[PDB]
From Swiss-Prot:
Top-level lineage group: Eukaryota
Family: In the N-terminal section; belongs to the sugar phosphate cyclases superfamily. Dehydroquinate synthase family.
Role according to the record: The AROM polypeptide catalyzes 5 consecutive enzymatic reactions in prechorismate polyaromatic amino acid biosynthesis.
Active site, UniProt feature: H139, K168
Oligomer and partners: Homodimer.
Name this protein carries in UniProt: Pentafunctional AROM polypeptide
Full-protein residues shown: 1044 to 1573 of 1573
Region (3-dehydroquinase): 16-237
Positions of region (Shikimate dehydrogenase): 250-530
Subcellular localization(s) per the UniProt record: Cytoplasm
N-terminal signal peptide: none
Length: 530
């Protein structure tokens, strides 16, 4: 989790500072865009039952879990005190310690531990850390601790190094020169030590240093009630700034295939750049052979490319590496360039399955699919991704339905014997086993412009009746937009998703693999459908 962040070029995290996590939930998917983690500023939370001024353990815990049910992002648990720029009283160390211990007990990924707390308390928190990583932090609100002559900073590093998984040092900038002295300091300390370091100056004058701090920079978003500290930037602003100073360079992205004339992938990715402050372009590049794409892959400014029909298999030729999924499904839709130095390495990945997986992940709310029953309909390439996706989400019985047994068997035999696949024969229908089968997830991968034979439709109708609360139906076709089966399902009260949603989320996964950043589904979807 930290190792992920360390080998990543640039990480950021959101300073979530609502008074209640309930207030965050409606727009949470928009405000976390581009972030690798979420800091819950515990000092900003307001407990309705308090009367001593401190959030109770029960409350803070209800809040933290409420958030964990709405996002998979790692969490940073931060109690920031008054003299470090937050709201938590400095005199109340025992109450802070109690809170931080609790956070480690329910598996927060990180805890911010201020170097103003007693060494007794710091040690006790260190002794109980478990898997939680400690961020040892100090903030110089005075702006008097020089980075060029850093006696007081080095005392703090000394104290922190006994305990730290990460060290966070934040100055207050009086002028440009303070940001420059800070970079000198960054170079010197980083040579002499290998605990990872968050390092910048707050203040409007400090903004350069935030931009240059690559590892775990805090960011905010316009919908949050306030900045956590002076000079703080949004993700959009942060990228915009990094582009303007020459840190992030413009990159050309592409779509290979034929016909691609009418692909809406360029609008999808164009929109994503615009919402994240990135300077990239994305272009359809239709070719008659696959071999004509090789000169594109070698452009000095090539940032990646999607691959659609008929080149998902024939392009694999040019890859040096494959992701597990690309190898397993024997197909590439996402080409990722990696400059290890002056060597180009091309990595093929496949996000087609992510269209399925990520759609369910978002459509489910609280509902976990661990130990539930699913149904996949169809036997093409997409059905295989659907089976993998349902399995990966924890479905313990994956029902598989087709016109013929041989079709279902071909698909089944890709996976091992204990992959929870249970084939249904539409001829010899085992009605009594199926009567008691309550489904939580369904995926149709078959064509929508053809009405089915009424011996298969009959079975689909019957199974869809038996439905778990919050159960989700997904149709992978978008032609028509509202399909025959979707109607059947919707009348039976299923939460329904369409193939355009999945297509959009495939693209977004590709975008994340390229830029290191997520993009918001809603606004990107609104421009694709236009």
């Amino acid at each position: 989790v930290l190792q992920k962040f360390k080998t990543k070029k640039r990480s950021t995290f959101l300073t979530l500072n609502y008074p209640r996590i309930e207030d965050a939930l409606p727009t949470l998917r928009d405000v976390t865009v581009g972030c690798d983690a979420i800091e819950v500023r515990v000092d900003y939370l307001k407990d309705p039952k308090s009367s001593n001024g401190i959030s109770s353990l029960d409350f803070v815990a209800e809040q933290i879990s409420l958030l964990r049910c709405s996002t998979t992002l790692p969490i940073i648990f931060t109690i920031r005190t008054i003299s470090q720029g937050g709201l938590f009283p400095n005199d109340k160390e025992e109450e802070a310690k109690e809170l931080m211990l609790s956070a480690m007990r329910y598996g927060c990924d990180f805890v911010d531990v201020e170097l103003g707390w007693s060494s007794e308390t710091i040690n006790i928190l260190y002794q109980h850390k478990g898997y939680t990583k400690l961020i040892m932090s100090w903030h110089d609100l005075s702006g008097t601790w020089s980075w060029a002559r850093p006696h007081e900073w080095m005392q703090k590093v000394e104290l922190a190094s006994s305990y730290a998984d990460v060290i966070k040092l934040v100055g207050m900038a009086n002028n440009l020169n303070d940001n420059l002295e800070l970079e000198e300091f960054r170079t010197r300390i980083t040579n002499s030590m290998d605990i990872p370091l968050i390092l910048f100056n707050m203040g409007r004058f400090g903004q350069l240093s935030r931009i240059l701090n690559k590892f775990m920079t805090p960011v905010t978003h316009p919908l949050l009630p306030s900045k956590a500290a002076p000079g703080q930037l949004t993700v959009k602003q942060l990228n915009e700034a990094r582009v303007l100073i020459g840190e992030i360079l413009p990159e050309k992205f592409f779509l290979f295939g034929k016909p691609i004339k009418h692909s809406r992938s360029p609008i999808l990715h164009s929109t994503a750049y615009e919402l994240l402050g990135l300077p990239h372009t994305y272009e359809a590049f239709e070719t008659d052979t696959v071999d004509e794409v090789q000169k594109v892959l070698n452009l000095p400014d090539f940032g990646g490319a999607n691959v659609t029909i008929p080149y998902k298999l024939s392009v694999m030729k040019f890859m040096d590496e494959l992701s597990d999924e690309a190898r397993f499904f024997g197909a590439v839709n996402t080409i990722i360039p990696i400059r290890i130095g002056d060597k180009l390495v091309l990595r093929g990945d496949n996000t087609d399955w992510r269209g399925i997986y990520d759609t369910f992940a978002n459509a489910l709310d609280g509902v976990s699919l661990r130990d539930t029953n699913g149904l996949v309909i169809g036997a093409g390439g997409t059905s295989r991704a659907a089976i993998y996706s349902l399995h990966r989400l924890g479905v313990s019985r994956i029902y598989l339905l087709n016109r013929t047994l041989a079709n279902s068997y071909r698909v089944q035999d890709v996976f091992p014997p204990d992959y929870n696949i249970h084939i249904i024969d539409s001829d010899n229908i085992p009605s009594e086993e199926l009567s008691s089968v309550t489904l939580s997830a369904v995926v149709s991968t078959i064509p929508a412009d053809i009405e089915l034979p009424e011996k298969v439709a009959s079975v689909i109708k019957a199974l869809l009746a038996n439905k778990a609360d919050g159960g989700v139906f997904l149709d992978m076709a978008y032609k028509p937009l509202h399909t025959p089966l979707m109607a059947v399902a919707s009348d039976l009260e299923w939460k329904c998703c369409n193939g355009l949603e999945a297509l959009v989320r495939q693209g977004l996964a590709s975008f994340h693999l390229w830029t290191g950043m997520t993009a918001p589904f809603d606004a990107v979807y609104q421009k694709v459908i236009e």
